[PDB]
Amino acid sequence: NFVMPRQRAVTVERERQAGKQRDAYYVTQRVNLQRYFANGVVSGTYAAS
Amino acid sequence: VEPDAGKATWVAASTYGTDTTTGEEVKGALKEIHFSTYKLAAKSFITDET
């Protein structure tokens, strides 16, 4: 529990056509974070005053 | 017969791509020139008895 699923890692790609006096880099992955059961994380408070 | 070209507008020194703000040069039309050949003629005669 707390496991992060992914089906594409970080990749890096680039163009030039149909640019215009430019080269440009793209980076795109696929991922998320999931609370499996109900609980097992606790924090605060630690409020305000 | 083609025509001259052209004028290109220089950039504003800050606009280096997206977008370049240079001229749009319109594709020069090839102009036809056609030639027309006119005719003339003359005739003459004499009779064999003259």
From Swiss-Prot, chain A:
Signal peptide range in chain numbering: none
Subcellular location: Virion
Quaternary assembly: Interacts with the decoration protein; each hexon binds a single copy of the decoration protein. Interacts with the portal protein.
Function in brief: Major capsid protein that self-associates to form 120 hexamers and 11 pentamers, building the T=13 icosahedral capsid which about 860 Angstroms in diameter. Responsible for its self-assembly into a procapsid. The phage does not need to encode a separate scaffolfing protein because its capsid protein contains the delta domain that carries that function. The capsid gains its final stability through the reorganization of the subunits that takes place upon expansion. DNA encapsidation through the portal triggers capsid expansion and the binding of the decoration protein to the capsid exterior.
Protein name per Swiss-Prot or TrEMBL: Major capsid protein
Residues represented out of the complete protein: 410 to 458 of 458
Curated annotation (Swiss-Prot), chain B:
Domain of life (superkingdom): Viruses
Subcellular location, record wording: Virion
Function comment: Major capsid protein that self-associates to form 120 hexamers and 11 pentamers, building the T=13 icosahedral capsid which about 860 Angstroms in diameter. Responsible for its self-assembly into a procapsid. The phage does not need to encode a separate scaffolfing protein because its capsid protein contains the delta domain that carries that function. The capsid gains its final stability through the reorganization of the subunits that takes place upon expansion. DNA encapsidation through the portal triggers capsid expansion and the binding of the decoration protein to the capsid exterior.
Assembly and oligomerization: Interacts with the decoration protein; each hexon binds a single copy of the decoration protein. Interacts with the portal protein.
Protein name according to UniProt: Major capsid protein
Species whose genome carries this gene: Escherichia phage T5
Gene coding for it: D20
Residues of the full protein shown: 210 to 259 of 458
